[PDB]
Design a protein around this ligand. Structure first.
Ligand SMILES: [Ca+2]
Ligand SMILES: [Ca+2]
Ligand SMILES: [Ca+2]
Ligand SMILES: [Ca+2]
Ligand SMILES: [Ca+2]
Ligand SMILES: [Ca+2]
Length: 1019
């Protein structure tokens, strides 16, 4: 087969996020969504709202000598063709006024076809040729497409993905004259026409690769010709052609009417907006409502993508699958259904809630950062507000049935309780810690979950959720309201704190090229979520002092009204020269924040209409509200306009949604999505008492001795509930005291203690309990003991953190099939040299029965044990040198090493069988801590100790840098010991029993090798 020149086609990109309009039928049968960009049709989605298939479809007109692209005509307009439907009309006029093209878009509600009603008028003596230029990017990729011709139609496909096969068919109601396929940048229609105003390439086939199709439209005799084009989609070519023809078969006028009628009927069936919405604000409402609606998938009803666009797509390559904003974000979806809910579309919210918990929720209960419309995980960051919003959606909708509560709601709420108040990522998806914005959703979600749990008879989980939410709610100011910020009076809620001390001036890099700034200096309107979600009263005083400074720092007055940047120094936007964001740049204005300020104003009884006015001034002629609008008077080399959409997403369903939701709030006189049960508790009048609660045991962190742990203390509350990892059990209160042996359910047990007063007030306490099984026995050892006989020194190198070789205890647990030998150290448990759990420590635990007398330990050890040993446990996560060893050096069994730095523990799992019938419960044992080393550094992988003075000298340098000092001897590379004196023990410390001391037991000058006492585990 002869392919036209250009293979495989030029590298391509997507389109700018700034859309003039978008559209889809209300009918779920039509699996197509179209977008418009600068006078052309940009990306069209199919079969799911998360898959773009087009880059550009526009017309070219020639006289026979020269040709022009309508995207080159400085004179073109866009306008919504119907005030009650998502149908747009683009008009292109020749710069010389010789011809005029009029295009009106619509889709066939019954099948996946995008239709274009076209009128071409020659205003000259005539004699012009008209060509359609359709450049696809099927299945979300510019490459991999194959263009062909059949039965007078232009065909294209990319079936490289079995789960998402895509093919199209461009058909002309009047057929085509000349038809051609080629490779972009060489044999494509425009490159061709530009050459000589003629279609020289006649090749009817091209690809796979980046191709484009071109079809000449036969013009009627006279000035104007009216016709229509149908772009049908299908799993295959035959399906696509058939769908397109079925559309033309019905006709543009008929299809147009049907499409426009569904939308009109949809709007007319929903709640009537406030009478105070003037014409323009009403149309903005109608278009915003439909647009939000159009972001729901047709194959997975209930799934809403953030936006049918790719921000800065002109700079985003299309060779590989990209996510853009055409993916599902729980947060953005929450904004969407909450808007449809405000407008009166209950079913969309029901499908939505069902979709979230069925398809996107993860087995652990939380919601992924992003996902495909089928639930397939996209980004994997942890945003706690994305787990809280779906709970709030179910709370609002009443989706509270026992089954849904136990299997859906509880796991999500339990995750929140387990995650703690700090979110690893806040709503802007960039950093973590105590977030005003996220903590507001966390508190509201748990407060709501509490009522749902209670309503379902689960008092334990209710107390846990309420007590937790209550504590975070009363800690809002302590954690995030700074009092020494470098702006205004210095008193305001900051954006996020890493420590929970808003006055510590802790810094961090804020990404996107913003650099390092103290948290004290970063202002963010996220605190407004507190009143919006009923977490604080509308007139809360703290939210009030945040206003002035926040406005000064990130607000600005545009001609349409006041607007806000997300936060101080935000760099997520175009660069100073106007070029698209590419990892760094400068954040612009977010119109949705005006809608947010408006809900806060409304909640306080003020007129919110002006905020709607401001939100609408950010829209284009098509009424598309963008994520961002330019904030400078200077239009860089790019055509940026103050108050107009930038290169990012437009429309942003979220911004569209925020406009509708506020509008509804205006009609009701108060924000309509605020959770009533949550506001009743925190935003109403009279506050509640907080009962006293004192948990005396356990401590913040501990290790249990069995499958149960004693949880006790004092309180003046009526009831107390002790919950571990989501399992709550009541603790009966007796004369202000309580005490319960609660069951441990995991290796790590998060224990929440909730105290509930007779009037409803709560107090909470959290404790963490580590569990390895029933404790056989233990051995203790003093800290600051890591100096051998009392003269040893750590090797100067940094890696050797202090206390690394300082044992503080040894605990043995019966762990079912294994024995868990837990060693605790004073120093931090590191693992830099990349090893199993640890790198530096080499502890030995010689097990025996106290028989015989002095018996040598392992080779490079340089020590003896008080009595004979049957086996020794080597804890060395280096060189696979760990396990239980017989006295002859034979490793009788492998072992697993786990590090628990939080507890400064080093766990060694030893299968019971490894200790051939030697029960540690009645065995004698010696414990010694050495430093691991390479064979070439000393016998048996033990880092030797050398003369103190010799070491102090530092000759060579590696001795005082990577070896122990204060013992005896110098380096000798001729013998395996590498030490010229192995009389001194290489143990930096060991365990001794009563009446004896480490200084005497390790005193090698008074005897060598030293004899380490054989001890017994105390129960
Ligand atoms: Ca492709
Ligand atoms: Ca292409
Ligand atoms: Ca689920
Ligand atoms: Ca010690
Ligand atoms: Ca030595
Ligand atoms: Ca010791």
């Amino acid at each position: 087969t002869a392919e036209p020149p250009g293979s495989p086609g030029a590298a391509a990109t997507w389109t700018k996020g700034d859309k003039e309009g978008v559209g889809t039928s209300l009918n779920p049968a039509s699996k197509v969504w179209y977008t418009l960009t600068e006078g052309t049709m940009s990306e069209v989605y199919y079969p799911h709202a998360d898959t773009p298939n087009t880059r550009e479809l526009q017309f070219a007109v020639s006289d026979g000598t020269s040709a022009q692209r309508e995207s080159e005509q400085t004179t073109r307009t866009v306008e919504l063709a119907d005030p009650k439907a998502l149908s747009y009309r683009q008009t292109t006029t020749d710069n010389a006024g010789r011809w005029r093209l009029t295009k009106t878009y619509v889709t066939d509600p019954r099948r996946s076809t995008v239709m274009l009603g076209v009128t071409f008028e020659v205003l000259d003596g005539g004699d012009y040729q008209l060509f359609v230029l359709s450049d696809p990017s099927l299945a979300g990729t510019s490459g991999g497409d194959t263009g062909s011709v059949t039965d007078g139609a232009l065909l294209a496909s990319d079936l490289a993905d079995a789960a998402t096969p895509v093919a199209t068919a461009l058909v002309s109601s009047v057929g085509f004259g000349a038809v051609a396929n080629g490779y972009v940048g060489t044999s494509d229609g425009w490159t061709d026409l530009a050459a000589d105003g003629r279609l020289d390439n006649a090749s009817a086939t091209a690809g796979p690769g980046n191709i484009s199709q071109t079809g000449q439209i036969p013009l009627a005799a006279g000035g104007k010709t009216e016709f229509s084009l149908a772009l049908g989609f299908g799993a295959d070519t035959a399906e696509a052609l058939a769908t397109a023809k079925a559309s033309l078969g019905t006709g543009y006028k008929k299809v147009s009417k049907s499409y426009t009628g569904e939308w009109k009927k949809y709007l007319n069936s929903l709640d009537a907006p406030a009478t105070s919405l003037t014409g323009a604000l009403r149309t903005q409402y109608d278009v915003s409502l439909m647009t939000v609606k159009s972001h729901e998938d047709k194959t997975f009803p209930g799934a809403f993508i953030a936006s049918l666009t790719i921000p800065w797509g002109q700079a985003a390559s299309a060779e590989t699958h990209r996510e853009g904003y055409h993916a599902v974000w729980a947060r953005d979806m929450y904004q969407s259904v909450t808007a449809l809910l405000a407008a009166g579309d209950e079913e969309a919210a029901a499908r939505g809630v069902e979709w979230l918990f069925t398809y996107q929720q993860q087995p652990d209960g939380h919601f992924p950062q992003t996902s495909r419309v089928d639930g397939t995980i996209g980004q994997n960051g942890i945003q706690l507000d994305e787990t809280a919003f779906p709970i709030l959606l179910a709370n609002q909708i009443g989706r509270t049935d026992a089954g849904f509560y136990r299997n859906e709601l509880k796991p999500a709420a339990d995750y929140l309780v387990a995650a703690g108040p700090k979110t690893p990522q806040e709503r802007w998806e960039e950093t973590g810690g105590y977030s005003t914005s996220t903590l507001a959703s966390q508190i509201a979600a748990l407060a709501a979950a509490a009522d749902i749990a209670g309503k379902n008879g689960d008092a334990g989980s209710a107390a846990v959720y309420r007590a937790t939410a209550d504590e975070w709610q009363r800690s809002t100011e302590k954690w995030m309201f700074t009092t020494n910020g470098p702006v205004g009076d210095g008193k305001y809620y900051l954006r996020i704190s890493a420590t929970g001390n808003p006055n510590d001036g802790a810094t961090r890099d804020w990404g996107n090229g913003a650099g390092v700034h103290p948290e004290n200096a970063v202002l963010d309107g996220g605190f407004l979520e507190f009143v919006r979600l009923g977490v604080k009263a509308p007139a809360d005083p703290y939210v009030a002092d945040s206003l002035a400074e926040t406005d000064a720092s990130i607000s600005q007055e545009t001609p349409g009204g006041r607007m806000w940047h997300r936060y101080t120094y935000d760099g997520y936007g175009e660069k100073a020269d106007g070029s698209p964001w590419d990892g760094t740049g400068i954040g612009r204005l977010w119109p949705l924040l005006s809608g947010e300020r408006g809900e806060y104003a409304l909640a306080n009884g003020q007129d919110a209409l002006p905020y709607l006015e401001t939100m609408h001034s950010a829209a284009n002629a098509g009424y598309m509200i963008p994520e961002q609008v330019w904030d400078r008077d200077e239009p860089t080399s790019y055509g940026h306009e103050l108050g107009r959409s930038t290169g990012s997403a437009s429309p942003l369903s979220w911004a569209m949604a925020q406009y509708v939701r506020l509008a509804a709030g205006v009609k009701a006189g108060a924000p309509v999505e605020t959770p009533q049960n949550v506001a009743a508790r925190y935003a109403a009048g009279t506050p509640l008492s907080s009962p006293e609660l004192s948990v005396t045991a356990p401590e913040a962190l501990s290790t249990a001795d069995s499958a149960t742990a004693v949880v006790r203390g004092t309180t003046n509350a009526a009831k107390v509930y002790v919950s571990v990892n989501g399992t709550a059990t009541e603790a009966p209160v007796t004369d202000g005291t309580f005490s319960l042996d609660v069951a441990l359910t995991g290796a790590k047990n998060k224990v929440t203690v909730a105290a509930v007063a007779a009037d409803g007030g709560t107090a909470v306490e959290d404790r963490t309990v580590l569990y390895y099984g029933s404790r056989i026995g233990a051995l203790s050892d003093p800290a600051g003991d890591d100096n051998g006989p009392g003269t040893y020194r750590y090797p100067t190198n940094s890696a050797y953190v202090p206390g690394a070789f300082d044992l503080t205890g040894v605990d043995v647990y019966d762990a079912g099939d294994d024995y868990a030998f837990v060693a605790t150290i004073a120093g931090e448990v590191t693992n830099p040299w990349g090893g199993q759990a640890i790198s530096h420590q080499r502890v030995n635990i010689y097990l025996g029965k106290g028989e015989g007398g002095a018996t040598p330990g392992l080779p490079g050890t340089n020590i003896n044990l008080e009595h004979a040993w049957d086996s020794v446990i080597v804890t060395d996560g280096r060189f696979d040198g760990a396990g239980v060893y017989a006295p002859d050096g034979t490793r009788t069994s492998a072992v697993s090493l786990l590090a628990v730095p939080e507890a400064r523990q080093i766990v060694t799992r030893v299968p019971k069988a490894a200790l051939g019938g030697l029960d540690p419960a009645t065995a004698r044992m010696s414990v010694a801590m050495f430093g691991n080393a390479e064979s070439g550094e000393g016998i048996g992988n033990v880092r030797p100790v050398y003369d103190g003075a010799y070491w102090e000298a530092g000759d060579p340098a590696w001795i005082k840098e990577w070896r122990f000092g204060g013992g005896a001897g110098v380096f000798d590379g001729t013998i395996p010991s590498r030490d010229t004196d192995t009389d001194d023990p290489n143990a930096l410390d060991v365990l001794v029993g009563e009446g004896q001391t480490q200084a005497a037991v390790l005193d090698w000058r008074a005897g060598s090798p030293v004899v380490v006492p054989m001890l017994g585990l105390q129960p």
